[PDB]
Amino acid sequence: IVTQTMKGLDIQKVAGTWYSLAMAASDISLLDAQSAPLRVYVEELKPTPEGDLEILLQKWENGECAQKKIIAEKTKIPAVFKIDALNENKVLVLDTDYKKYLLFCMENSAEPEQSLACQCLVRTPEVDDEALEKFDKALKALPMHIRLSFNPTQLEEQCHI
Amino acid sequence: IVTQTMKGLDIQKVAGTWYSLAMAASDISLLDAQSAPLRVYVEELKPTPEGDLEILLQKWENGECAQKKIIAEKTKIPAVFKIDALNENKVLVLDTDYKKYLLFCMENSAEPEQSLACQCLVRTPEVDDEALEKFDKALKALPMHIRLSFNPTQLEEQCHI
Ligand SMILES: CCCCCCCCCCCCCCCC(=O)O
Ligand SMILES: CCCCCCCCCCCCCCCC(=O)O
């Protein structure tokens, strides 16, 4: 369902620390609680020389902020990865400037809108109006029903408080 | 903190059934859970001939969808009401066409952004892109951190499911 992707993406250049400035989902139950399914906070991206991609994130599990390491296997499209969970979930890089932000979405295979979540990643704990601009514009199309945003304070905290 | 209001508002003409198409809050904890503080669904508005305003809403309380009747006492400004809870909370009518939608916000007295929530009300269980347009434009300024939207199905349901 995600319609735009970043052309000529250089996945090595996205390596580094990132902040989940904002997130949006097609379903409220995707982001509603602290424990919700795709309510995940990004730490840093770590691509492998084979073009793969390892991800370090926090995920509130069992009334507690847990760290996590996911792996996204690159595919034939530079901007689309597939993580190693059950039901081949696709992670799509929409856009990025490598040093200011990253807009990615992640959807179910064969089931978009029921499972579809997008994030605005920034390199600093500062809210980026330009970035949020592009993010809201990108999802303007998409059928999003929930939408969060975090403050600098919450971004320096584990699990955004 | 809410900066725009509806001029020459005719509070009698807002009488009737309404749907909470969308909501936004300055704080995630205002709308996060089913039980959150300003996560309230509107049924119908009922103004009194003295220009007062009685409100019927649903509010998930104790893991259960409860109905509720609030009263908003009119003030010297036609578009601003004050409901009878502790700490004089102000309800502000931003805009409306009486027969398509209503954009209102409700804030704390002397404490905006910590407590500030806004809704897009529509007369039908249809999502209204024009309406959501105006709503997102109105809050574009405001410091909102959470934002929900509901589908026709959820709007015919008590507590939006
Ligand atoms: C290419 C840009 C990288 C963007 C980061 C992608 C984040 C993937 C997160 C997938 C959700 C999985 C988290 C839930 C963990 C669990 O299984 O409990
Ligand atoms: C003038 C337009 C009318 C808009 C409707 C205003 C809705 C007011 C809701 C105030 C929040 C109070 C709900 C919580 C109830 C409780 O005390 O448990």
Curated annotation (Swiss-Prot), chains A, B:
PROSITE patterns: LIPOCALIN (PS00213). Coiled coil: none annotated. It comes from the Eukaryota. CDD domains: lipocalin_beta-LG-like (cd19416). GO terms for molecular function: identical protein binding; long-chain fatty acid binding; retinol binding. The keyword Ribonucleoprotein does not apply. Belongs to the calycin superfamily. Lipocalin family. This is Beta-lactoglobulin. It comes from Bos taurus. The gene is LGB.
